[PDB]
Design a protein around this ligand. Sequence first.
Ligand SMILES: COc1cc(CNC(=O)CCCCCCNc2c3c(nc4cc(Cl)ccc24)C[C@H]2C=C(C)C[C@@H]3C2)ccc1O
Ligand SMILES: COc1cc(CNC(=O)CCCCCCNc2c3c(nc4cc(Cl)ccc24)C[C@H]2C=C(C)C[C@@H]3C2)ccc1O
Lengths: 532, 532
Amino acid sequence: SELLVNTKSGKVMGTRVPVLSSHISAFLGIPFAEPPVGNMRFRRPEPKKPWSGVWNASTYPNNCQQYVDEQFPGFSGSEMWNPNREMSEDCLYLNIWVPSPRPKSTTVMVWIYGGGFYSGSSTLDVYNGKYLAYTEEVVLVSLSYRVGAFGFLALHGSQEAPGNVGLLDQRMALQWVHDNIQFFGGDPKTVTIFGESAGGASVGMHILSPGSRDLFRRAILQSGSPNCPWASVSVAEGRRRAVELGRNLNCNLNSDEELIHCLREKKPQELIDVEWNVLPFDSIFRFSFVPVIDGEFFPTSLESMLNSGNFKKTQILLGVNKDEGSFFLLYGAPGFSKDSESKISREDFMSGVKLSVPHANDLGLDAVTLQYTDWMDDNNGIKNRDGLDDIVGDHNVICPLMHFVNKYTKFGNGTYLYFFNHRASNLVWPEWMGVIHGYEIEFVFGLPLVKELNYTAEEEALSRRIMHYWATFAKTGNPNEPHSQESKWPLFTTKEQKFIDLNTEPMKVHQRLRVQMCVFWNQFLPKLLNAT
Amino acid sequence: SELLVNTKSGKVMGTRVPVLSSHISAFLGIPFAEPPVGNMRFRRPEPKKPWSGVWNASTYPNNCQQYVDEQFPGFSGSEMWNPNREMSEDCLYLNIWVPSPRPKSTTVMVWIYGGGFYSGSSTLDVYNGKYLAYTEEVVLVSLSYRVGAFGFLALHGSQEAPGNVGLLDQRMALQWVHDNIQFFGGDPKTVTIFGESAGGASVGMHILSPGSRDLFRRAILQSGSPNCPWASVSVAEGRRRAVELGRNLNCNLNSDEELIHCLREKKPQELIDVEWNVLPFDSIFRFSFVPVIDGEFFPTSLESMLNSGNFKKTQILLGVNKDEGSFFLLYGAPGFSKDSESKISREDFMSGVKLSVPHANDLGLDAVTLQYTDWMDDNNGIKNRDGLDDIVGDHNVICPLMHFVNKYTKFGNGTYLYFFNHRASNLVWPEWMGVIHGYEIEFVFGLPLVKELNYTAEEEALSRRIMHYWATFAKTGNPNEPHSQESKWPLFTTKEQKFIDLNTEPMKVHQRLRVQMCVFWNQFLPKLLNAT
Ligand SMILES: COc1cc(CNC(=O)CCCCCCNc2c3c(nc4cc(Cl)ccc24)C[C@H]2C=C(C)C[C@@H]3C2)ccc1O
Ligand SMILES: COc1cc(CNC(=O)CCCCCCNc2c3c(nc4cc(Cl)ccc24)C[C@H]2C=C(C)C[C@@H]3C2)ccc1O
């Protein structure tokens, strides 16, 4: 009845789940695409053919095939991001949480997981949608999409491995929401897509792509934007990395058809095992198989589309965390450790900036170094560590996003910008990592509202504020409730460039988020590298 | 008797001058060279031929031919720098102040005036040597040398206008001191040369030049150093500017001999009137006729001599003023005024950096701008004004001197570094100009001891401390009197890089004078300009 829904593709049976003191409806693992397996590996997705009978949607689906982190086995701080279900190429499913009783036609939010386009799962604990759907009375969807070579191997000109098929996976789930969410009590005219990291970049890519714009109303971008340096490659570089993946696996490289035929014969773990080997440089915050600027999903270069206003004009809400860089330094740069303060020598600092800006020449590396070194105190291990942290986060997340913010606001219909700088009281990662890449998500999804997770009362109130900002923005295009007496999150404007902090303290309005370093990263350094 | 002195060139009769409550002997206007007139214009100096009878040395000599500032007619702040005697090409004379009674063989200090190599006189009120000679019981000499085209027209390969002849004028006065100062009670084995601005660059150039090294014992450099970007040119640029001087005056330009012959026919003021026209760029802190890197007075490039230790190894004392740049901005940059606070617009700020770094490409101008602009507050007219002030002083005086200081200290026998930042109580220049280029000289020469000049008691104390540091350094190679109870000015070392402030407060020791900006000016910007 409430749990039995007839969709355009067939019937689905959800399940009644507890949430806090109440209950909500959950429809877990609904298929939206044909399994992209066998001869369909690397191909564009195809709509799921209708089924007879009742699809049992009481259970999370498989996760897509991906690299699995084993750096800290058993450590909750890293395991919380690993697949918590069996991995399978049969992984194109979505999950829906619907308030009980079913609303008539309420706001829809569609979550797009991040993970550098090489990892991510819709089924992670931290993406459990019941708290946001319950508390804010929205219909919450989480989609999935192929990652790694399965989603983004790009042999442009081939229609068997064209590239971007993971983005087309996301679009197909959006098309499914457009076509079916009304049967779950959602309004298909009021859909907000939101995501973090590669999911935030993805959200911005759908803003850019003509083939995506009519499938959602407005957008939220968390710690990611479509113009980030790690988020796309040229057709030439995607082709180089695909050929190099074949070479690592002794594939016939004579032609696209032969290379593709060889790669379709490999077991999924065989591709994953060599995935990192195709990167052109020793680097951090760089991923092998990512969206390709192809002329079809993206009509022209991202910058030209941004300059001409060739993108969906709507309202956006977006922001960054204080220490986006620490996670990537922990995993890939010398001198960093989970169990120490990680004071960074001068030698390791220099090694770090080379890894963080792998595409720079020697003059470029000197410019970065000078911009972030205190030459009154250059042997300070704390300042060297924090300076590397700022380099990674500024270059890869904050300044690309601020470039997007400024370009979008010229043509958009409303921008709201945040800076999340709260370090959770129960964080299991050490102090030096600060406010980590990914660790705003738990507040967005209302995990502080769960008593046994041991957040403070102030953190529950912060999560509730953030959920209400997100859902109110999704409903109306404005995170603020009218006639309310709390402080108002102001519009970001071209002239005043205002943003807010998100933390447990009363709201402060600031202007020009990290403007000094982002002039360096968005204007001077690109000019220097283009001139040298 | 006391006033009658027989020198190797002939007898001189000095004069008894009052000084504070006492008297000392002055020998004013002694010739040390043949008049460099007629066919000797642009030529190396020749020793003064011996004369019969008594040279009346009771009167200041003429000043050399030079551009005369008429920007603020009658204003004491600018006219204190103008020739206070008749100008003449017959100007190669020196002045001596001798304690009374005549010492047996005491320390000698020789003053070399600055003025951009285009102006300067030994006879200015602020260079009056009687206060320092009386108070510190030294024999004080001030020399003269040809400036502008008359001293530094350079047509390399010609022996008629070889270049650097003003530096040879200085050398010949030093040779005269070496041969004759014993007859005035001075010890030719304890001669300190000191100078400000171009005089300070000159001092450093005598340290470098083999033909100068044996004519003095140690050296003091004030707000100038031999490697300053304004202090020398290549033989090719020197030749180009000499040929452009001829073109401005309708000279035959077919050979050195005809060009030189044409220029020797001109009245002195005809050369002066077109002097500034030969500069390659619109600029500030750039001067037309300066030393040439010639392979003779300087064996190789100044940077290679500094790197190899090819210079005199002795003790040096040197330093800079807090606002070296303001005088040059007042006279040559848009938005600056003697009679206003000179808040600088963004447009005028950008005009100023182009004038301040005239040799930079657009990439280099962007680099300077970013290094000195607060992009949270870029329309702040005070920050824009002070930033341009810092650019001029850092680029032209402070960071060249710090490069010299660090290179020299690797090989020398003792370095003492100061930062003069006292703004005089009776300054006639506006407050935005701060601590001006040239305005430590009056403290070095003891003017605050003259009650009529209306300095404070603390400024008299400051002048007495500085005169004692300078003379004790001249005497011993160390500004400090060991066994005394005063705060000790420490050696500058390669590792610790210590320096003191000079002002009316108790002594503060600091380290790494303006190290952050000087890394930009001495390492990064030249590498950027060399790549592009
Ligand atoms: C070849 O280069 C390297 C490759 C690797 C392989 N390992 C990795 O890239 C990182 C391990 C896989 C992802 C770890 C779990 N994912 C996390 C994620 C996030 N934040 C994390 C924060 C911390 Cl402190 C720890 C893990 C986070 C936030 C989101 C973004 C990403 C990219 C993955 C995932 C979701 C390690 C070192 C290297 O030098
Ligand atoms: C080619 O560019 C320009 C050229 C000129 C030509 N005029 C000048 O450069 C100024 C002419 C000399 C007038 C000042 C010389 N005296 C000063 C001197 C010093 N400090 C001064 C400080 C102030 Cl506030 C005022 C004068 C000072 C310190 C010493 C150093 C110099 C260069 C000359 C003299 C001694 C004017 C505007 C321009 O844009």
